[PDB]
Every structure is written in C-alpha cells, then in structure tokens.
From Swiss-Prot:
It comes from Homo sapiens. The lineage of its organism: Eukaryota, Metazoa, Chordata, Craniata, Vertebrata. The chain holds residues 11 to 311 of 370 of the full protein. Activated by Ca(2+)/calmodulin. Its main location: cytoplasm. It catalyses: L-seryl-[protein] + ATP = O-phospho-L-seryl-[protein] + ADP + H(+); L-threonyl-[protein] + ATP = O-phospho-L-threonyl-[protein] + ADP + H(+). This is Death-associated protein kinase 2. One of its GO terms (biological process) is protein autophosphorylation.
C-alpha cells in the first residue's frame, strides 16, 4: 500500500487561489515547482480522535485514495500524488478549471436534446467505467459534474469528489445515510441495502434538472424533500416539459424507480434509445427537441 509523502506540500508546490471548499476539505489551486505543471490541491482535515466533530477518519481518507488510485478514465478526475502533515492529508488532483457543467449550459443561446445527450453520455461513460470496477460514486450531483475547458465547442466532463464512493462487495450488505437529500435514492433515505443502483437514480435527477430547470423531488423543507423521494412523487409538469420528447421522459422515468432491481443499470441507460438512437427517424426527433434554457437559467443564475 503506497505511503503518503510526509514532506511539507508548500516546499514542493506553489499554492494559489481557492477553487472551492465544503465541510472538511478546502481545494486550492497549485503548481509543482519541479515540473511547472498545474494541479488542484484538496486539503482534507483529519479527525482529532473519534467522537471529534471536526475531521475525516483515517479509513475514509484511505478509502477515497484507494479508489482514486484505481481510476484512469477521461471522464473521471485523476490522482497525481498524496501528501500528509499532522493536521491535513492533502490530495494533489488533476486541475479541472472549466467550472460546473450547468454553469456552462446556463450561458448558451440554445441547447438541443442531442447536445444534452452528449453531456449526459459523457457522465454515463464515466459511471460505466466506475461500475464495471464495482465502484459506486454515491454523490452524483450537478456541482460534481465539472468541465475541463469551457472555451471549446463541446466541453469534456470530469466527475469529481469521490469522498462517499465505495467498492461494492458481492454478498456483503451496505447501508448508510449520506449525500445531498435532493439527489439521493430512496434506499438511502429508507436505510435499505445500497449498491450501484443509487447512482442511476441520481443520473435521473440530474437529467430531470438538466432538461427542465426544476428538481423532481425538491420540497420547501428537507422533510418534504425526503417524503417525495420515498413515495416517488414527481411529475412532468407541462410548464417545464412542453418542449421535452417522449424518449427523454421514458429515460428519466425508467431511472426514477423505487425497486432497485427494476431500475436501469448503467449498461441499459447507455443503450436507451434517447442516448443511442436505433433508426435515423428518432435521431432527428432528438436533434429537433429543444431545452427551455430560461426555465433552466431562472432556477440557476
Ligand atoms: N468542496 C468541493 C470543491 N469543489 S472544487 O474546488 O471545484 C474542486 C473539487 C475537487 C476537484 C477539483 C479539481 N479541479 C478544480 C476544482 C476542484
């Protein structure tokens, strides 16, 4: 098991602007002095003991690193190196400086469902690689779908933040409560057995929001949000879904299913007609169907 470098990160990197933060990790933009190449440095604060309200445990850091070290894919963030001092364990990761997918979408003059499925298909490709390796992401949500270079015509998506990711064991049961309520599967809220299926639910939510601007199960309070999810109470309200094709809806509807066995696995979602058209007729429908960008820009900004 590769050991973490014990040197001071600042002796090897020039630390720069803050890229983001969140709970127990601050991500700063850095540059290695020897090579001159740029990266992003994720400082994870370690726990003091175990009750300790501040910090992440050793296991959960070692899990994340273990998982990150396995993954080399074009739609997934790649690890460069790991450092450690007395307070923080610092992950030096690929620099993805294109911002969030949704921020880029929110600036477009127009967006067809074909253009939409391009970006969704990248997310699917990435999740397929993970799932083939029996790795659940468990935190798929818009702010975790980043872009490399927004200045190109079709930006390239990179999945980030594997802090809740987990290797799925055959025969072993895994239950936990985590994630952002708005995007979590029913099995998470119910504290029922989890697996690869939860990611597919969250792709459903992501697609629902991407096409419409509205969130499927979001309530006025966390309570309401959780009750909507558990009953699977959403609709395709024509105020948001008048421009939306039947196939787009079929896709979302087969993902947002309570029964984990009946939900689409990743390989099925890649092969869905909305992602992979079977004839040239349905390819035209997708190219002609538009997304309502103002509904989207309103619920974003
Ligand atoms: N707490 C999440 C902070 N998100 S973030 O700073 O944008 C961010 C998080 C993780 C990896 C990144 C790689 N490159 C740029 C930014 C990155």
């Amino acid at each position: 098991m590769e050991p973490f470098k014990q040197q001071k990160v600042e002796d090897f990197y020039d630390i720069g602007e803050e890229l983001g933060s969140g709970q127990f990790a601050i991500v700063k933009k850095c540059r290695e002095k020897s090579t001159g190449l740029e990266y992003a440095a994720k400082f994870i604060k370690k726990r003091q003991s175990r009750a300790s309200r501040r910090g992440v445990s050793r296991e959960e850091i070692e899990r994340e690193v273990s998982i990150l070290r396995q993954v080399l894919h074009h739609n997934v963030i790649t690890l460069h190196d790991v450092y450690e001092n007395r307070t923080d364990v610092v992950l030096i990761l690929e620099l993805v400086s294109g911002g969030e997918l949704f921020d880029f979408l929110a600036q477009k003059e127009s967006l067809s469902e074909e253009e939409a499925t391009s970006f969704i298909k990248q997310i699917l490709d990435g999740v397929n690689y993970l799932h083939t390796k029996k790795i659940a992401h468990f935190d798929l949500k818009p702010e975790n779908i980043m872009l490399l270079d927004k200045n190109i015509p079709i930006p390239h998506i990179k999945l980030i933040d594997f802090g809740l990711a987990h290797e799925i064991e055959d025969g072993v049961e895994f239950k936990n409560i985590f994630g952002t309520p708005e995007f979590v599967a029913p099995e998470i809220v119910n504290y029922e057995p989890l697996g690869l299926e939860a990611d597919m639910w969250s792709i459903g939510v992501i697609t629902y929001i991407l096409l419409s601007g509205a969130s499927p199960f979001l309530g006025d309070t966390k309570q309401e949000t959780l009750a909507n999810i558990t009953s699977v109470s959403y609709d395709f309200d024509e105020e948001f879904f008048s421009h939306t094709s039947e196939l787009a809806k079929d896709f979302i509807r087969k993902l947002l299913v309570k029964e984990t066995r009946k939900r689409l696995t990743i390989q099925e979602a890649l092969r869905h007609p909305w992602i992979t058209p079977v004839d040239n007729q349905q390819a035209m429908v997708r190219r002609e169907s538009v997304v309502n960008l103002e509904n989207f820009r309103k619920q974003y900004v």
